[PDB]
């Protein structure tokens, strides 16, 4: 959190090596199997941990809407369904996931779910999930595992084209239905 | 004599002034405010669009149409055919109204006065006058 308040001197799409360290690296080189930092931080275990998107993970949280949709506060689940990690391009993990929402719309409860696909990028610790062929007004989700672990994430429901934030969402792992 | 580098420069600076929507409207309105301030003899021509009230929707829509057409011509500066066609189209839209051909010089005057306020770069006055004239020449008979 402190490191977030501090910011960095690196450009966008760059990865700062140490915590205090001044070296920057392209985020296309992060966890690709090659030591690019003078201190090898871009290949460190904490950095390259793949458990935020370990399939089977079910992140749950409360979605608070303030744009796009007129929903009251409600549960949302990001359910990791699969991951692909090319051995020729380890910089990113291609994630497939199901996004479920418990809506108490009309007196009774109803599940609103959709299938989605995207990626987890190690450098900025970010999971991007856009709706698989879902023109049907399902908004994308962007989660930042910025809480120091692989268990909690600060998310947003966003429009894919503009990255406009329509909802605030904070998921934690909990996990087991 | 609006050559390659001239029209390239004008294209760039025009992108600076008109390409950002947040100050495109201010740009148009200020152009008109200046034009009408320094040449009120001109205002009679714009009774159709409330030229006496530039803060009105009629005139706003007008100024928008203007800047749009100017965008088209500046953008066609390198396509001689389509340029000539567009400039004759502008001609058709102006010939019906008894417009003193030296009013175009005044228009250019206001344009050059207002432009640097929306340019992060230094106004290339030569390029702008040359290209503006190769446009106005075509608009006039």
């Amino acid at each position: 959190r402190v490191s977030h308040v501090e910011g960095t001197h690196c450009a966008k799409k760059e990865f700062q090596c140490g915590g205090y360290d001044q070296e920057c690296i392209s985020d296309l080189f992060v966890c690709d199997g090659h030591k690019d930092c003078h201190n090898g931080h871009d290949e460190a275990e904490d950095v390259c941990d793949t458990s935020p998107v370990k399939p089977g993970n079910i992140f749950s949280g409360t979605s608070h809407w303030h744009d796009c949709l007129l929903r009251s506060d409600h549960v949302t689940r990001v359910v990791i369904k699969g991951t692909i990690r090319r051995n020729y391009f380890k910089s990113r993990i291609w994630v497939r996931a199901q996004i479920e929402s418990d809506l108490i719309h009309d007196g009774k409860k109803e599940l609103s779910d959709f299938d989605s696909k995207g990626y987890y990028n190690f450098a900025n610790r970010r999971l991007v999930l856009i709706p698989i062929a879902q023109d049907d007004k399902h908004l994308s989700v962007i989660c930042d595992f910025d809480r120091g672990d692989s268990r909690r994430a600060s998310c947003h429901r966003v429009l894919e084209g503009t990255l406009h934030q329509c909802a605030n969402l904070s998921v934690h792992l909990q996990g087991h239905h | 004599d609006c050559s390659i580098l001239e029209l390239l420069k004008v294209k760039n600076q025009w992108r600076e002034a008109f390409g950002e929507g947040h100050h495109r409207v201010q740009f148009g309105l200020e152009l008109w405010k200046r034009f009408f301030d320094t040449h009120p003899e001109v205002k009679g021509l714009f009774k159709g669009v409330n030229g006496d009230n530039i803060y009105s929707p009629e005139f706003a829509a007008h100024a928008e149409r203007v800047l749009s057409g100017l965008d088209m011509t500046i953008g066609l500066l390198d396509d001689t055919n389509a340029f000539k066609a567009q400039v004759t189209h502008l001609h058709s839209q102006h010939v019906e109204r008894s417009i003193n051909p030296e009013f175009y010089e005044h228009f250019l005057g206001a344009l050059l006065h207002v432009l640097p306020k929306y340019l992060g770069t230094k106004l290339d006055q030569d390029a702008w006058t040359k290209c503006f004239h190769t446009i106005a020449d075509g608009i006039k008979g």
């Binding site: 744009d67 796009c68 023109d135 007004k137 429009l159 894919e160 084209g161 503009t162 406009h164 | 294209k11 760039n12 025009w14 992108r15 390409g19 929507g21 495109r24 409207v25 929707p57 009629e58 706003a60 829509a61 928008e64 149409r65 749009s68 057409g69 965008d71 088209m72 500046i74 953008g75 066609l76 390198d78 396509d79 001689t80 055919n81 389509a82 340029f83 000539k84 066609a85 567009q86 189209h89």
Partner: protein, 148 residues
């Protein structure tokens, strides 16, 4: 299914990836495609453009025309958050289209369809639904006082 503020903001944002340049090439290409589609589906309308030389689609006259359209649409979209000005410009465009006899509302529905067919081919993450919902609004104003 109205044209929401979100829809308008969306369209305004995505808009700079569809043509939009200091050069007219993309406008000509894309608008040109829109009309190829229109004429393909409503060939009767192709006659209405003899004045701008549709028969010679490489002519400066037709290019300049396409650019005029593209820029007209640009003007409309840029006015999405200035409803009064949008209304005046909409009226202006409407009268411009009333002067042309043979232009019908059906042709407008047609061009809406062709736009919706062309735009998603030139840019990804183009919100088609938003486009449709907003175009309906624009066209229904331009094309009223025209003949079904």
């Amino acid at each position: 299914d109205c044209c929401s503020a979100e829809d308008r903001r969306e369209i305004q944002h995505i808009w700079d990836t569809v043509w939009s340049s200091s050069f007219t090439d993309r406008k000509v290409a894309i608008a040109g495609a829109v009309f190829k589609d229109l004429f393909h589906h409503y060939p009767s309308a192709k006659g209405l453009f003899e004045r701008v030389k549709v028969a010679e689609p490489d002519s400066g006259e037709y290019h300049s025309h396409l650019v005029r359209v593209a820029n007209g649409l640009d003007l409309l979209i840029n006015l999405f958050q200035d409803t009064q000005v949008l209304d005046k410009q909409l009226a202006h465009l409407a009268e411009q289209h009333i002067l042309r006899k043979g232009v019908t509302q059906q042709f407008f529905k047609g061009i809406g369809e062709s736009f919706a067919r062309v735009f998603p081919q030139v840019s990804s993450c183009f919100n088609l639904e938003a486009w449709n919902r907003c175009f309906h609004t624009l066209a229904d104003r331009i094309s009223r006082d025209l003949p079904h």
